Design a protein around this ligand. Structure first.
Ligand code: HEM
Length: 161
């Protein structure tokens, strides 16, 4: 059974696939393909995994894995591990407007970043997610490696059968 706390976020459940792009002042721009799965085990959190790969040659780029907790309806904690040696807790809120869910999260809202000894220096991450029917879109802003908070990613995914 779905935990009551997750009712508003039930449209996230399932498999999502699509494409996005990214940039940062210290790197060259890039694009990627993305696969996401949201699932649950009957508690007040979703499980979440992401895999991305290069559009050109399908080489694995970034992945992330963890949990989207509901901290009472309307509140979210996104808890993630990254294979780059970084952990992330983003905190925020969401709203339901018919078939549209808007989630706004940030490490800067009493969240966390952890850096392994060999990780790049990331100090903030902000995420804006929109689920509109069978479309999931997002942007991610990053403060890292001497640069102010600014876009690093954005993508559009579609619900898979
Ligand atoms: C869809 C997800 C993502 C993709 C496809 C992606 C892709 C890239 C690519 C291709 C680069 C440049 C090449 C490289 O350094 O490997 C890069 C750089 C970077 N990314 Fe990401 N990234 C993603 C998510 C993230 C996230 C979530 C973080 C932070 C936790 C992050 C932090 C960085 C940093 C710090 C740089 C290095 C900048 C530098 O050396 O100056 N990325 N990313």
């Amino acid at each position: 059974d779905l935990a009551p706390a997750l009712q508003a976020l039930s449209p996230l459940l399932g498999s999502w696939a699509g494409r996005g792009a990214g940039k940062y002042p210290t790197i060259r721009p890039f694009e990627y393909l993305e696969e996401v799965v949201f699932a649950h085990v009957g508690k007040p959190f979703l499980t979440y995994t992401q895999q991305t790969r290069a559009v050109a040659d399908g080489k694995p780029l970034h992945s992330e894995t963890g949990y989207l907790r509901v901290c009472r309806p309307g509140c979210v904690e996104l808890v993630l591990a990254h294979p780059s040696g970084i952990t992330e807790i983003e905190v925020g809120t969401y709203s339901v407007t018919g078939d549209v869910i808007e989630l706004e999260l940030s490490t800067r809202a009493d969240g966390s970043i952890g850096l392994a000894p060999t990780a790049k220096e990331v100090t903030a991450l902000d995420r804006s997610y929109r689920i509109d029917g069978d479309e999931l879109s997002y942007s991610l802003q990053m403060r890292a490696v001497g640069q102010p908070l600014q876009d690093h990613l954005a993508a559009v995914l579609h619900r898979q059968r």
